Amino acid sequence: NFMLTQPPSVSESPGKTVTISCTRSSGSIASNYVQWYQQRPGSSPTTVIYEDNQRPSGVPDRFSGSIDSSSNSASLTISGLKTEDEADYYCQSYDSSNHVVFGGGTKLTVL
Amino acid sequence: NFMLTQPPSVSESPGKTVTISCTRSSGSIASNYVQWYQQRPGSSPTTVIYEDNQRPSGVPDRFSGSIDSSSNSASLTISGLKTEDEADYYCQSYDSSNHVVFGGGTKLTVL
């Protein structure tokens, strides 16, 4: 149906801002909601964003989501980088067909 | 809303059968569909089962899903164990507030 493409890595120093893009290969990004997950080594995925830009309870406002119709992409922005933010990040949407599609994953290193 | 609890680990010899369970903490397991993912180290989650028991194209019939009461659980069964099956396995469903819920994950070791 479609793929979601992510850069395999990003790094940044503590206190800085980092952006991770998720690009949909076919059909419009805005046809279905985008979610973002944080995964630490040995643990399960943790929702940081759902419905393109909503934060679950307990997720700090350092985490934000946005959609760019024109590049057919979603982005996750992390400001005030802390060393605990080091983790894998995945974007995720639906098919229509309805079925889940995961992006390839971005490994974030805090320098 | 609810949690999905899984055993942290399972192990078994090549050619054998292993079962991994997923237990819902409140509400019925049958209220929403259950999905299973395989995740190898360094990679993103791959669907092995969706809609309780459906296999995506290219997933071998060694992988099967089922659902039970009396215990409020879903299970993933892997027959004919191969050393490539070594990975983490996650169950996943939806609340009604619709939002995704992930299990804690099971690490499968092939002996």
From TrEMBL, chains A, B:
**Gene that this sequence comes from:** V1-22
Q: Which UniProt keywords apply?
A: Immunoglobulin domain
Q: Does the keyword 4Fe-4S apply?
A: no
Q: Which Pfam families match?
A: V-set
Record InterPro entries: Ig-like_dom, Ig-like_dom_sf, Ig-like_fold, Ig_sub, Ig_V-set, IgV_Light_Chain
The record lists its disulfide bonds as C22-C91
Identify the species of origin. Homo sapiens (Human)
Extract the ranges annotated as region (Disordered): 41-78
Quote the Gene3D superfamilies the UniProt record gives. Immunoglobulins (2.60.40.10)
* Domain Ig-like, first and last residues per copy: 1-98
Identification of the protein by name: V1-22 protein
Q: Return the GO cellular component terms, semicolon-separated.
A: extracellular region
Reading the lineage from the top rank, the first entry is: Eukaryota
Q: Where is the composition biased (Low complexity)?
A: 64-78
